[PDB]
Amino acid sequence: GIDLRKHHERSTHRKAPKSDNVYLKLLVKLYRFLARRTDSAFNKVVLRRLFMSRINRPPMSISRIVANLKGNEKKTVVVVGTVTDDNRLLTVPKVSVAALRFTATARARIEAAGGQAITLDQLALEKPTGANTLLLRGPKNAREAVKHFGFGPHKHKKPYVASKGRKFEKARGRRRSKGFKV
Amino acid sequence: KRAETYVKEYRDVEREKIRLQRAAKQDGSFHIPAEAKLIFLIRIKGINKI
Amino acid sequence: FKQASNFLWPFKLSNPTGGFRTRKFKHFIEGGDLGNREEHINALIRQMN
Amino acid sequence: NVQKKNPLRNKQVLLRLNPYAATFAKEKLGEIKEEGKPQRVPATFKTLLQE
Amino acid sequence: GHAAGLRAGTRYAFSRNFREKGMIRLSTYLKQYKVGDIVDIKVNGAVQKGMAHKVYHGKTGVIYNVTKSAVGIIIYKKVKHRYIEKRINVRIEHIQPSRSRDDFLRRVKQNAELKKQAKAEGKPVQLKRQALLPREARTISVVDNKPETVAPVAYETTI
Amino acid sequence: GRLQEYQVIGRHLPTESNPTPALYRMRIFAPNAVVAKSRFWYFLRGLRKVKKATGEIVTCNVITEKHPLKVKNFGVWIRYDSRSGTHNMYKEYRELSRTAAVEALYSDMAARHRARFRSIHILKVVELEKTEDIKRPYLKQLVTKKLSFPLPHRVPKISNKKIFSAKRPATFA
RNA sequence: CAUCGGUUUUGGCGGGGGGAUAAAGGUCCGGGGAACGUAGCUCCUCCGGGAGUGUUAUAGCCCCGGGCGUAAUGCCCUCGCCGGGACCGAGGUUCGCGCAUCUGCAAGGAUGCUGGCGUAAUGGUCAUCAACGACCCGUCUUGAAACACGGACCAAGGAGUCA
RNA sequence: AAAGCGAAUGAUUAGGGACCAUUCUCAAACUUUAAAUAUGUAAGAAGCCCUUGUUACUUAAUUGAACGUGGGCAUUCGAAUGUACCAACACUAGUGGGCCAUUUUUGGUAAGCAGAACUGGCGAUGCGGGAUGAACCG
RNA sequence: GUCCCACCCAUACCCCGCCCUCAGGGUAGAAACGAUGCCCUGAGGAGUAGGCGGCCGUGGAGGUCAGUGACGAAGCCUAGGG
Ligand SMILES: [Mg+2]
Ligand SMILES: [Mg+2]
Ligand SMILES: [Mg+2]
Ligand SMILES: [Mg+2]
Ligand SMILES: [Mg+2]
Ligand SMILES: [Mg+2]
Ligand SMILES: [Mg+2]
Ligand SMILES: [Mg+2]
Ligand SMILES: [Mg+2]
Ligand SMILES: [Mg+2]
Ligand SMILES: [Mg+2]
Ligand SMILES: [Mg+2]
Ligand SMILES: [Mg+2]
Ligand SMILES: [Mg+2]
Ligand SMILES: [Mg+2]
Ligand SMILES: [Mg+2]
Ligand SMILES: [Mg+2]
Ligand SMILES: [Mg+2]
Ligand SMILES: [Mg+2]
Ligand SMILES: [Mg+2]
Ligand SMILES: [Mg+2]
Ligand SMILES: [Mg+2]
Ligand SMILES: [Mg+2]
Ligand SMILES: [Mg+2]
Ligand SMILES: [Mg+2]
Ligand SMILES: [Mg+2]
Secondary structure (H helix, E strand, O other): OOOOOOOOOOOOOOOOOOOOOHHHHHHHHHHHHHHHHOOOHHHHHHHHHHHOOOOOOOOEEHHHHHHHOOOOOOOEEEEEEEEEOOOOOOOOOOOEEEEEEEOHHHHHHHHHOOOEEEOHHHHHHHOOOOOOEEEOOOOHHHOOHHHOOOOOOOOOOOOOOOOOOOOOOOOOEEOOOOOOEO | OHHHHHHHHHHHHHHHHHHHHHHHHHHOOEEEOOOOOOOOOOOOOOOOOO | OHHHHHHOOOOOOOOOOOOOOOOOOOEHHHOOOEOOOOOOHHHHHHHHO | OOOOOOOOOOHHHHHHHOOHHHHHHHHOHHHOOOOOOOOOOOOOOOOOOOO | OOOOOOOOOOOOOOOOOOOOOOOOOHHHOOOOOOOOOEEEEOOOOOOOOOOOOOOOOOOEEEEEEEEOOEEEEEEEEEEOOEEEEEEEEEEHHHEEEOHHHHHHHHHHHHHHHHHHHHHHHOOOOOOOOOOOOOOOOEEEOOOOOOOEEOOOOOOOOOO | OOOEEEEEEEEEOOOOOOOOOOEEEEEEEEOOHHHHHHHHHHHHHHHHOOOOOOEEEEEEEEEOOOOOOOOEEEEEEEEEEOOOOEEEEEEEEEEOOHHHHHHHHHHHHHHHHOOOHHHEEEEEEEEEOOOOOOOOHHHHOOOOOOOOOOOOOOOOOOOOOOOOOOOOOOOOO
């Protein structure tokens, strides 16, 4: 016998997507080969993000793409996720965006501005190593569920209440006039 | 060549300890053989009740 | 020495051939094995290696 | 290496790891004699070893 | 247990030594504390205002807030399975600077001096402290003192 | 076990207050040098306040009997801890070497007084130069005028694997 | 069976080093002692001894020093070689690390030769005897083989479902 | 823990000189002293030095405090060993009767009794030994 | 009571074979692969309450095997075999 504190501990990170998307399987095969046969650390990160689930790949808007693309113009924006359209952005400059998905409104506006709306397999063609790329991630903690995580006294989190009003959680433990405050 | 030096180095170190000890006996003084610097540990009592 | 010693995986010796003695878990001074057998560890190593 | 070979028992394996092993044996470095009349302890070293 | 208020069991901890009670030396009020200092809490029982709980007596912490006649101390309190940051407002009368930090501060200043001196001179020097090493070979002369032969003594005397 | 005799010289580690400390010599009967140094610090702790941590072993070498082939008489003074107190005793042995006498005592003192190595302190071992120095009856009877005795009974030596014998052995060997 | 490889067990051989460069020991040359007093001598018995003197004599012994002698042995530590036996042969074109020398090799895991049988001979199942071992399950419990409860046996049905 | 009472408090024996100088023995809720084991913190780059900048705080005061720009110190970046434990998050199960032993220890005459501290075990665990055994030894 | 040699054996230790788990590498101008594969390397393996993963089996539904079957389906018996 040997004095060990853990046995057969598994890696905590995902090693293959749970999706049955046949096209996504082809994409992972391409980036398994690229990440193995190149010294590009960009390829490894893109391969890892292809495995991630849907809550770990939040959508990004064109406005957030535009916000980060200065003065990083002449670079290809790479988003392993969905690029959405922003109404609050009245004009869209000429951009090169490679993403897993484009909403119909976002793809039309990017292309109308004269830019490129390409997929990640197209990106691997002219940029097999992310030579001039901007890898961008959407807002992870912007989800509604995260507002509830870690709820407790003096935590300023969102409670599980089925209605908004002067009732249902406003009396005791919410103001000093009724007992105490939190 | 490095093996040559080491074999010679081991050979000379041992004789100096012997020569120092013998010369101390002739003089009547005492030579401290210097404390050992390397030790080998072996665990021989299981993994239970510690 | 630190890097050379740490590079070596701990030696996985076998039980001594002939040893040890009647009472093993006592100090070497009082007829056991535990503790500091100063230069006698070489005889033990031959048995266990 | 499918089968570890002991250099202490396999001569060929010893030679890949220590080319000076052959020279050590022929030169008889393990059997070097010391010559000359030994210098014994004086009578003062004894009679002090015994009280 | 039955009684679990403050000052419980502090009969000896919060007392004062045998012949050094009464008036408090004024050097305590003249010490100056900055943010980031490392101080030792030692509750003085002669002043009952602004004490720290008996758990923090004898502990050490880092000053984080300085106010008129008291300072704030960040102390890590072990609570079962975790440590908790504890911010303690304790009067300057119950604390004193830790000499361990001062000994470190004289060493960091010294290390710069040797490194500066060595680089200018042109040889390398060792900055890390080294633990005690095994003794080297040495020769002992018996020209003055010769060994004394000692033997175990008989029981002889009953008392 | 089988004991050798070592001389062990110790000393307090020199300090600024005591640049040259005193040397302490002692003769120890021990199975090996590791025990001999252990016995030295045990005896020196009680005697001269010196501890192993604050001291160093100057030397530890074996003293060999000068004439291992001469039969001589030994007188040993010891102190031991019984189950109810501490007692001094004096014994006499007829051996070849001081070590041989000491091995005899440890077996003798274990056989008769049930004492153990951890309970016995060897105060002094001397060689009796003459026969009137002998003060014990079991030793005076071995140094008589012309010692000569037979060996009565004296069962023969037969191999323990020779289970059966054809004739009854005779005890006149 | 032969030649190898891995692991291991048990013997034997040669050569070094160390300690008081073992201590002893034998012979010789010196000095000093004594008795469990050798010869000689003086007393009683005198088959057989005892007593005294006597320090090597017509035995010897103990201590110190020195030559032969850098003697030997013994213990410990080492550098190598050679035998007896057992278990194992994983892998499956070359590549490698090495050694030798114009051959190759014991060097990234067994080959060669030989013999009997070619079938119930090896092998498997079952029954039985034999050696060693083996308390009755489920459950509650700190603790069940329990002198704690449920269980005579067999078949079918039988208990985390849906909004 | 030990130690102390010709030292405070409390208990306490005996003699002596005119209360004093001594004497014997003690304290979980006494003490001038005072260990062992355990215990807090530090051993630097989020660091150190020089010049200088900001403020509505502070100073008699461009004096300080806090945070910085620009320079200098380099991977010997300031003990050892290891890293066969990187950090965080979400959701949820079972559990909330415990028992035994070395050492310390409380009530009790004591208990295979009742109750605690550290640690290790059985529950949840077979194996070799203690003939036999939940806890012992390996 | 003490001291000394030799010997016996645990699922423990060492070496080797095999299973599985975990971890780390290689494999496409494909002569190329149930790539959810193959090849190489290393470590580890007890377990109630409990958690998770993969597989085996039963009654039905859609697709498919141009599937089996009165020259014998399903069932049942079988110290016969894999
Ligand atoms: Mg295992
Ligand atoms: Mg054996
Ligand atoms: Mg292998
Ligand atoms: Mg105090
Ligand atoms: Mg108040
Ligand atoms: Mg072989
Ligand atoms: Mg020798
Ligand atoms: Mg062999
Ligand atoms: Mg058969
Ligand atoms: Mg058969
Ligand atoms: Mg049977
Ligand atoms: Mg049985
Ligand atoms: Mg059931
Ligand atoms: Mg019960
Ligand atoms: Mg019963
Ligand atoms: Mg019931
Ligand atoms: Mg019933
Ligand atoms: Mg006490
Ligand atoms: Mg005291
Ligand atoms: Mg008193
Ligand atoms: Mg400390
Ligand atoms: Mg609960
Ligand atoms: Mg239970
Ligand atoms: Mg167990
Ligand atoms: Mg792998
Ligand atoms: Mg049919």
